[PDB]
Symmetry: C3
């Protein structure tokens, strides 16, 4: 046939057709469609602006650049999370506000399939949209998959705390992409009236935030947060961000006379100079020596007064805002391997004792934000269970996993439920055959493990057992059904109870069945510990 | 008595009076009147913007800078084309969007004399308005002469092929100048309702382009193309210009990640850095060794979708656009000396044989764009006439001259005629006494040789014979009469037949008389050869 | 005891409360309130633009930076003029368009106290608003004191003489600050309908200029010029400023091809680079060897055609403009110590003779602008009084003092009077106890000596005798009374005659009483000498 040419508001776009095994209707794929003017030069540290219209047919046939980030870590995360067989090597650029579209619709006719916009994770410091291939999900559940990109690290989250650089540029880009979907997705067989946003980790936190933001209202109709919500501390900076701004400014060789001066100076720096500063800051690794209360993990979401008017805690306390069906989930062992490995945790012994745990739990401050006075009690509650040093290690990993995702996620769901909107929860417990070889075979339900089911990895990568394939089909079905009706259930699928007062949730894995009061016991413990 | 002070829309302008031998009314001359905002910094590679208004009286008494170009070549061409006795040495600057005005009208009264706007040539790489002195033409034919400048080379034609740098900046400056004339020329005794545009070589091509462009519609009412039209290949880049953009970016020490990145990087380079890149690219000289299909002659006109919606060929096939009297001409020997000399052609032997000719005709690809398979037939059709090696040389020079100007010019004229608009053609055959000493005395009607007649060189430079003086008078008469009524004819002048179906044209020279079917035989030949 | 929080157009501002000895109602102080967008990058050498609005509560609790200037000289002048006990060390920055507000009004209620906007002096090269503490004045006279800042030196007065950089940026900032007062002062208990502008030295000349400018019309209703008016040559550049522009450009390592090129180049320079250029230019010190007619004192006010349509002289000759009560004053010995000391005058001998005088009066050209032919007559008229070499020194100082302030001030006052507007004059003769120790005890009424009475230094610094304290009270009374009714008089205060035809003025000092025809004899002499 002839390559797919869709006419968007800004101009014509030329994609390519790809057929999936066992599907007649080939899927139309468009790579690198600009949804905003390149945030270069003076546009750096300012809201994303509308893209300039193009005169003829634009070739959306090449993978776009991933936003500037640590090239090593960024690639590593892409190999570890990609659902396609061969990991696609990417390029770094400040010019990265693009989005990829995977539409199973027959463009030759009018279609309004539900739209699923994916927001990649990566601690808001690394990541890319190209990592995720939407071919399987689009074809299998007949939905339009849209993977978007947003400014990362300094470029997307630098904030002086005042009007000279409010911050949250990255989030504003996500909002900008959603508006683009509203104004263009129809030309791709998508229904702008049924847009579902879903992300994992930092992406889940992003979805969480968009759900609380007034700007994002009416740009989506369903939300899914996989392993990450707006109560995941490490990602949301509360307090005076001015010190961090000055520390970054100095590290980049910038004066700190005034806020206006810092932003101006940083806007003069080259993309490369800022990247070097990023590497000097050492943002994804854990700091061993020094003072834990000073170690800055990353540049996250802030309370800018535009995107967020107050803290996520304060915002979710009110119900005076528009609500939509929300699905919040976590994996069995969120801190099982992936994260600890990437941050270079001192767990090389395979075992830990009471004292060393308290020592680590303290240095883990930037991740769990647990006072040093609470350390004793917390460690006792989890590791005091047994004397087995190896069990204390795994229990220590549960400690962290719960503080970062378990409890935060459940509190978020509860508040969403009490606000009166349809809520759903799940706990993914499965070990994908696509796990890294360096990942211990005992770790099941590690961070990002559900990504292989959601994105139909079993149908793009080889070796998936009939069990894994079946699992992926189920998950995609649930996800797509949710995208369709704001309810995961559907014929031929295990019943998924709504997260109401009974607090029922679905345990997804080799044996998928409903259960109740997820992490109920832990949320209780931590709500008191943190209440000092 | 008192220097001329005209009030334009942007502010007052002060010029100077200059009397020509035999004319009572002194001519008011204004040099360097800004018609746009300096395209400095971020304005680089962007459409020309309105000039900022000034507060008092601006001195238009000094020659403006000529746009950044090869200083050596630019000066050389200026010396070779100037119609004034002493060649005026110019300065290079990115700040060059100015125009010069020569008005014979008595500013103390209301006058509405026909306006002639001159577009200098120079392969769109070099050239300047100051080269041309309009004093003689203005006084002699009582018309307002306006010599404009536009961005050359990289500065005025850099194109990434997309919306991040469409290209054709230079042309847009020309259109910007014409708009300036419309809103201001009346303050100088000019009739904005009778504006004629005329240019030579690259300027002849510009006039041809402007005639095809929707943007320049209604900014002129007659056009004259001397030795150059929109079908003169070398100047009109067809196909993917992306590679040339990247090759330039790299030579300037820039990344090529994306089009937006290239334009950003090139916008950071200093004028000097870009001038060095220009010189490294070696754009005016012919490449001897390597592959001819790769040798990029220059950065010409492109199909941006703004100035030109499709190719010149495609555009002239339609008659759904506004038309005006058009005069198209060529010189007897376009590739006689000047051009080959500036491009450093291997013709130092004064003689050529069948084999060497095919060899040269091939390396001349970027000029004639003749397939290597056609070379044999072409060389045979021209040099196969005799065995005289010296005659083969000259016949080779006609070969080129016809492909670049002869045939293109005649096709354009025919299309214009068939489109239903008043068309006129001419063939200038004369050897000005102002020719370079290094120019063989046998070459008559070389490139740019009519410039001395058109601009009345015989009345500014010395030694003109009464025959040459008389010829210049006649040419200026024809040109101004055309500028006046869209018809060259007038009492006291040889009848100039309209280029209608009989294809009558005027042969201007020592003996000026009508003729018919100019280059009719060659157009036929080349139309088939190129039809492969 | 809750810090004061005022809501301005652009956002909420948080200040601090400060109680003065003997005043119940504490004064609300706000430091560093932005009244314009930081003039960084491309905004350099362009008019001030509106400040971007802020999202929450901005802390106006830290002193803003002083505009880039000679750090050493700037600090010295701040120490010498400050009315607070401890001089506040400041920081340099291009980001300096801020203002400080001292309001005695009880914000919890609606107040419309008269507003006094202070413009600091410093030859338009140095100075800061923080130097002046409005606490005493605000409290003692119950008026809102506003100290503003404006661009200095190159940043605020660079002019190419054309539209590419008209100049007078600093003055435009002053007008920008006044508009801010109009749109916000009400929120601080101020009355936008009763705004009085007053400054000293360069600030006095600024007030004078604003009184002549059409742009500042309706932004103030009363004006006070202390030791400086628009006829103080040294600050107002008349003639072709192009040469100075080129000299600065070159000194900063910039081409001078064209005006647009110079401005572009200088815009690229870093604050530090321009600061270095400033120091190289050596603008506040006197040039000993070379040609006096070339020594450029500073970058002053120019006739841009925006702020000033013609020269101050020419402007005050007309009465077709809006007028307000104007108070013009001078000190007994304007060139007594401070100025000569800062400019490094060769007066280290304490005595001078007729010949050396003429020698100095010549090199003092950039200050007094006296022709070398007039030097003889002028020196004779002043120093010819006695043979005492020490008396000649002091008489020489009066010579200068009268040419720069005495005569200028009186001419301005007379014109203002004749123009039909309420005029007042005064001559301050008092030696503050806060004078520098290096200042001879014989100098009384030195430049800036009234600053300590006007700003109530006696109530912030220690050691003020009951005589000095009383003087300050009186002065502030006169000043505030003027700010209130456009007339200094009031009960319990010596009668201050209006400067009408009798030319009565007030001599302020240990003995304050009216007098007549101030400098009437000198104005006479100089009006002829300068009439050549
Ligand atoms: C160096 C030069 O040629 N520039 C000159 C410009 C011209 O107006 C423009 O360049 C276009 O001529 O302004 C002047 O002529 C002028 O107003 O007195 C002086 C200046 O030197
Ligand atoms: C603009 C740019 O330089 N990027 C690349 C694009 C990508 O698709 C972009 O992400 C979106 O066009 O692909 C091209 O081949 C294209 O023809 O558009 C050009 C280039 O290599
Ligand atoms: C880093 C610094 O010293 N700047 C200070 C600025 C000032 O407003 C400006 O410098 C003008 O005074 O912002 C603050 O006042 C503020 O809003 O909290 C505090 C901050 O410390
Ligand atoms: C876009 O794709 C078409 C064919 O699908 C091709 O002709 C064109 O060159 C491509 N554009 C580029 C150069 O990326
Ligand atoms: C140009 O203008 C200057 C001042 O702007 C003026 O003195 C003179 O009339 C002119 N000088 C020349 C001929 O450039
Ligand atoms: C402003 O003052 C408040 C107290 O009034 C304080 O909390 C804050 O830290 C200060 N500055 C900032 C960073 O907002």
């Amino acid at each position: 046939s002839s390559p797919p040419v869709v006419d968007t508001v800004h101009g014509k776009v030329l994609g390519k057709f790809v057929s999936l095994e066992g599907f007649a209707q080939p899927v139309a794929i468009f790579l690198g469609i600009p949804f905003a003017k390149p945030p270069l030069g003076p546009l750096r540290f300012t809201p994303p602006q509308p893209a300039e219209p193009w005169s003829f047919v634009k070739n959306a046939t090449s993978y776009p650049p991933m936003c500037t980030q640590d090239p090593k870590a960024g690639q590593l995360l892409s190999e570890l999370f990609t659902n396609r067989k061969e990991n696609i090597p990417l390029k770094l650029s400040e010019d990265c506000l693009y989005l990829n579209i995977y539409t199973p619709a027959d463009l030759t006719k009018k279609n309004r399939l539900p739209v699923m916009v994916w927001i990649h994770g990566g601690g808001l410091m690394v990541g890319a949209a190209s990592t995720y291939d939407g071919l399987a999900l689009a074809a299998h559940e007949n939905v339009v998959v849209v993977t978007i990109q947003y400014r990362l690290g300094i470029w997307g989250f630098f904030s002086t705390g005042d009007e000279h650089s409010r911050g949250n540029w990255g989030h504003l880009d996500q909002v900008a992409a959603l508006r683009w979907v509203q104004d263009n997705i129809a030309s791709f067989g998508g229904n702008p009236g049924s847009v579902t946003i879903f992300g994992e980790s930092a992406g889940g936190e992003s979805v969480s935030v968009l759900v609380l933001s007034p700007l994002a209202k009416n740009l989506f109709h369903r939300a899914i947060s996989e392993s990450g919500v707006a109560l995941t501390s490490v990602l949301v900076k509360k307090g005076d961000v001015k010190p961090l701004a000055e520390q970054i400014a100095i590290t980049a060789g910038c004066k700190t006379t005034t806020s206006a001066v810092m932003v101006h100076c940083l806007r003069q720096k080259t993309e490369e100079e800022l990247l070097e500063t990023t590497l000097k800051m050492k943002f994804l690794s854990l700091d061993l020596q020094g003072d834990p209360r000073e170690s800055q993990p990353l540049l996250g979401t802030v309370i800018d007064g535009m995107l967020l008017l107050k803290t996520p805690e304060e915002l979710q306390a009110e119900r005076n805002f528009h609500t939509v069906p929300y699905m919040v989930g976590i994996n069995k062992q969120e801190f099982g391997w992936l994260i600890p490995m990437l941050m270079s945790y001192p767990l090389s012994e395979g075992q830990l004792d009471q004292k060393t745990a308290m020592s680590l739990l303290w240095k883990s401050y930037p991740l769990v934000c647990i006072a040093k006075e609470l350390i004793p009690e917390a460690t006792e509650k989890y590791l005091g269970g047994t004397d087995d040093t190896v069990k204390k290690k795994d229990l220590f990993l549960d400690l962290i996993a719960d503080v970062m995702f378990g409890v935060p996620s459940v509190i978020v769901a509860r508040n969403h439920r009490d606000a009166g909107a349809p809520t759903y929860m799940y706990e993914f417990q499965y070990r994908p055959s696509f796990s890294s070889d360096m990942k211990p075979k005992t770790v099941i339900g590690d961070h990002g493990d559900e990504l292989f089911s959601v994105f139909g990895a079993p149908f793009l990568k080889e070796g998936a057992s009939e069990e894994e394939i079946r699992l992926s089909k189920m998950v995609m079905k649930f996800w797509a059904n949710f995208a369709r009706n704001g309810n995961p259930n559907g014929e031929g699928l295990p019943h998924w109870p709504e997260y109401n007062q009974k607090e029922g949730y679905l345990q997804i894995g080799a044996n998928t069945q409903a259960a109740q009061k997820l992490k109920d016991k832990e949320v209780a413990f931590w709500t008191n510990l943190f209440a000092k």
